[PDB]
Symmetry: D2
Subunit: 410 residues, 4 copies
């Protein structure tokens, strides 16, 4: 027997030469992208076989074997429908309808409190999917960068817990929602911020990461970390957003000074610098595509699905998902957890980083916010998404009424 030969016969279809475009089309049908880093040896070898000839361009079993040998494990599970979403082409047409249905919710106000969130057009709308297996799909404005803002809060929390542990991190930050009563209070009863997802909590978490080095290396290290989280897809920085966030962060300076007075920072913290680092971390830029890979890493137990690298420890991902569940959508967190039941995190730029554990990661983006700070189209999409699929954290995998389950084929 031989696995490269088996794969060849199921794609060759009784024929005895496979055109290269027919293998690439079959490959995209799985949902993988030709630029998937795990396929680079096979793509490199197709580029090198495509130097021998403009004439022919077809692959027999040993030229097919010559190329796919290196990636045969990953290619066969794609072609034997063993990915988390077997009929991925069906699923993306459901993603497309959902996207078109939110695209009609043109309500909401674009954030204007700094001129950089204000440049953004209110009709921009993108959705990007990445599954725990690296199947990819985008629809809308998924390759235009925008700032993470508070979507960076779960990421730096994950980094902090990954490096220092749950017990150290939560000496300085709570792990509960504050209650739809104390959005205005900075501290709880043990004089810690309520959770890493609020501004007081995020600011303390920022003070914990890579202590003892300067802000340039702290920022470089986090940029490093989000690079592995996004499988090296687009991660950037908006100094324009950075400069406006700092000439307007009077609430954040208030929080910083309060926390300094309540001794909420580690010993030896230069608070005003932490606020500068914090403003930098919220001006980091992503696209829907690159952010959905960050989301997919959290959906995949800490392994980036398009590279296979272990990026976060399982304790760090669990905590971050646990706190995205309950504190992730500002004053909407309770309603979102009840009706949508997915770990999610909103930001004022209009992104909603969304995680379906064991299935997929996503980044929705539309700048118009609702009265609570969450993207109107984004919020609409997540209700529709869970209304269509048994993706709700407490849906049942066996008895789920008339909803659809993309993890299965029949």
């Amino acid at each position: 027997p031989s696995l490269e030969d088996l794969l060849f016969y199921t794609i060759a279809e009784g024929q005895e030469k496979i055109p290269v475009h027919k293998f690439i089309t079959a490959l995209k049908s799985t949902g993988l992208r030709t630029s998937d880093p795990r396929l680079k040896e096979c793509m490199d070898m197709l580029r090198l076989t495509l130097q021998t000839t403009s004439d022919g361009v077809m692959l027999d079993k040993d030229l097919f074997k010559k190329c796919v040998q290196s990636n045969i494990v990953l290619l066969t599970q794609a072609f034997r429908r063993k990915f988390v979403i077997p009929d991925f082409m069906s699923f993306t047409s459901h993603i497309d309808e959902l996207y078109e249905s939110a695209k009609k919710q043109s309500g909401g106000k674009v954030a204007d409190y700094i001129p950089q969130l204000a440049k953004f057009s209110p009709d921009l709308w993108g959705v990007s999917v990445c599954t725990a297996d690296g199947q990819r799909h985008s629809t809308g404005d998924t390759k235009v960068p925008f700032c993470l803002q508070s979507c960076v809060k779960p990421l730096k929390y994950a980094i902090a817990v990954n490096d220092l542990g749950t017990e150290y991190v939560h000496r300085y930050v709570g792990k509960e929602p504050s209650g739809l009563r104390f959005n205005k209070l900075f501290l709880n009863e043990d004089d810690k911020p309520h959770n890493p997802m609020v501004n007081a909590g995020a600011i303390v978490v920022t003070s914990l990461i890579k202590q003892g080095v300067n802000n340039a290396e702290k920022f470089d290290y986090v940029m490093q970390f989000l690079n592995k989280m996004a499988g090296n897809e687009y991660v950037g920085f908006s100094n324009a957003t950075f400069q406006s966030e700092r000439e307007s962060g009077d609430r954040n300076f208030a929080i910083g000074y309060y926390l300094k007075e309540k001794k909420c920072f580690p010993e030896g913290t230069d608070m005003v610098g932490i606020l500068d680092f914090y403003f930098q971390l919220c001006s980091i830029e992503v696209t829907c595509e690159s952010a959905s890979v960050m989301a997919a890493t959290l959906a995949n137990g800490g392994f980036c699905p398009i590279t296979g690298e272990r990026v976060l420890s399982p304790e760090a991902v669990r905590n971050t998902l646990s706190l995205m569940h309950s504190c992730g959508m500002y004053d909407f967190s309770g309603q979102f957890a009840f009706h949508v039941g997915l770990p999610a995190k909103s930001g004022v730029a209009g992104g909603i980083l969304l995680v379906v554990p064991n299935v997929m990661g996503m980044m929705c983006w539309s700048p118009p916010l609702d009265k609570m700070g969450n993207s109107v189209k984004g919020i609409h999409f997540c209700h529709d998404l869970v209304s269509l699929c048994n993706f709700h954290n407490y849906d049942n995998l066996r008895h789920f009424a008339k909803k659809l389950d993309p993890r299965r084929e029949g």
Copy 2:
């Protein structure tokens, strides 16, 4: 080919008659109990053959077909190791270790406010498991009756959502935790109680069930419902607990009048009557075994796992799970969601109704409570359980470090 014959040969062992004590043993190893109602026809005929030919005791291949005939589907997935927990015998050895480690946590105080909770011994400790497929295991005092107390709140909420729908029910009760800053406040910003898991919310929920009949029919309507959730195992009533709760419920009488003044009940509500109904639902009794089937029904999308009956709509079960996750353990709820990450519900009798979605339901019971009202041993068990198995809501099924996965081989 044929399914009874294959199953025969995989148990027949190359040999050509199967002793029934060996068939009964292979069966119990899967985790089913021979008294599973889904198995009653196969058991009834095994008893009839042990009568019709009392000479002999062994089963040839066509007498085997005569017995496993109508339950062959369930028997095959039991014997082909296809239940949610394939190696049930190993897993119960883990449950036993977990129980013995929680059994040495002797802290906590038994509830004193009525002499019925105080007469319970502090050495009582039991955990009962029931899977989404009906595999059962017990350890400790799992056949001792006790009242559900607030463990009844997620059930009556589920009954309410099942009968009237999410939107109607939550016209009268919120869907969030209050914030552990407001056990003291009864109402949220829209003058509804914060959620069904606090006393004020349960009292409003109690007022929604079976409107228009008297308390005797409402109670029996709830009783029919809880019988079905537990596959007809023990569901009872303590009038002793009921009478003491009503002569000491000055706080719930306080809540009732407040809700009446703030107009939180549906029109035409007899507030004091609802309060009497509420004290009754909190005096309903279960054992660990019978309640664990109720928990397993919630883990099973609303189908009772030992009968196959649809008891609750999936909307009802999902809502109830979401609110047990966040509001189920009084002031320990946030910590419980973070560290244990399981839908659970505490009661003052010392029970913790616990649900691992898609796997199993459980009921742990130990009367000594901690400072927050949660059973000391029960809480210790739930931390151990999640530290051992990847059952945490946001554990990963593919990458889970040093944890054990009982769903895997």
Copy 3:
């Protein structure tokens, strides 16, 4: 010399027979009424000389002396302008302007939550004065009975402190305002109600009065007490108001059960019976005239000004004045204390029991209540009054700008 004849010469005209109508008209100018209980022997004697032989309304120096003998001390300070308000006739003319200008504040809604207060016309508006010296003046509907409702709370608080002492009473009730929006929190940090002026505090206070006898004797004791406080003017009971307060007091029953569970009552308290006593105390009836004497006792250190009796201990009156200052006007207490600076207490029937310490007590009554529960006309009047006179608690008696001081002469 002689004090009765000196008095005679001061009314005597330079002439030396005084007509009896001239003495009585000169008497009323003082602000005293001929039916003042301290004047009864002098009136009894005028009733008897007015028998003599009806010829000549005149009193010679020996017949005048025969009548004014027994009350000569009180009559001499009345006629030698030694009362707290010397020119009382001028002062009532300002009361009349203040009354007529408030009479045009037609805003507000009559309480209708029971049909007995809803029965009252918004037409009704009365003001009654009684000074620390027994000078009386009314304007408007001052002889119509209405219920005290929460205006009774300072009075039963005074009775409690008079009988048991400050220390015992305040084991069960706080002595501060709650903070203006804690009206439905029932207890403070020490699990006592915030003060006697809120429903929870009043309910605890009711449980403290005359412990150990039944509600009929408890009520008879408070009624006798309010009789001595009003110099035996009208005090009654509206059973109509009583039954509607009790078949509608769901908030008061909620409060009672809450207090029972938190063990806020003295040992051996029958909770639902106390609530019945409390509903009775709020159904006690007064008129403006009768109630202004009760207020005047409070302005007078606990001595009723029209009888001379010690009715309340000074400790009881001081505390009651202290808490009417801060807690007397519901959510208006802070604004009322700041701008008006007088101890006052409102009730839902439209009353405002008002005390000017060392000067006079008042009862304003107009049923239409404002958005906060206080009588519109009454509130308008209390501002005008303090805007006209240096009666504000922190006005200065020596340097007081544009304001008038009715205690001075020229």
Copy 4:
């Protein structure tokens, strides 16, 4: 007749020359000090008579006329026992007893949060009286400087109202106590600090005074203002306290930024500069003697009692008294208003600026603070004072049980 001649005979003692040492003793017994600025012409002339005529220290009627001529009015009310406290020598014996009674309360902790309050000895203890007529008495450490700290908050508020009016000032700051559940909150329901006596309210009030000039001119404008309140007695500045107060004020910097974000300052406010001004106003130094004249100015309707100057408008003084009544002693204000019933204001240095309206001003000073921030000895003295005299806001001036009234004779 003639007023200089009358006064001579009541002192002339039956003789026809008054020894000057005897006139000075008769004067001091009234409670005036010979250096009273209102007495300067009489003292300058006695000193000059003591130079021109060494030949016998005796004063006849024509030379006694020569000295008391210019200050004749004030001298007569001093000697004809018309000052607010006629038997001033008796009363000071009561102040001394009260002082020695609190001197035995050696509990409490001296504030150490900056090294300047930490070096004050714990049994420094002084009380200084100044009446509405300028009668003075001190006992203990009454001439040692200390900073006002929050004792400056009522003075700046009075200056703000004096210059800008009630309506303007209270556009930016409330006028009620917060409630012993909102001591931690910075803002009320209308996004203003609760009252001028808490730090957020003091900080906004500081931002209102003398807008448009720099901090040097602002500072001199307030000092010049506090100089008149103290009859030009010692008002100074501790730069040491100022430098340590600005390097420890992260809580007030927290307050500043929060108020900036919630826009609680006038337009064009330099917040960080206002904070510097705020740190200066609390480092202003006084003694018990000089501060008690400031208190006496508020007790005297805005006139400094030892000079005759109008320093504050009556509206300014009334408001400031109303808000020290209810908001002046941190979390102790309600208990203090209830039991002591006097306008007072506490500071972390151990001062309590105390005002008995229409009678006298006081400053008590003892550095050891109790749990709530109030000077242990100061608070004990203030209870003692009101248990001894009927100065309580709602004591009665006519019926006051066994208490003493220093306004009366015997």
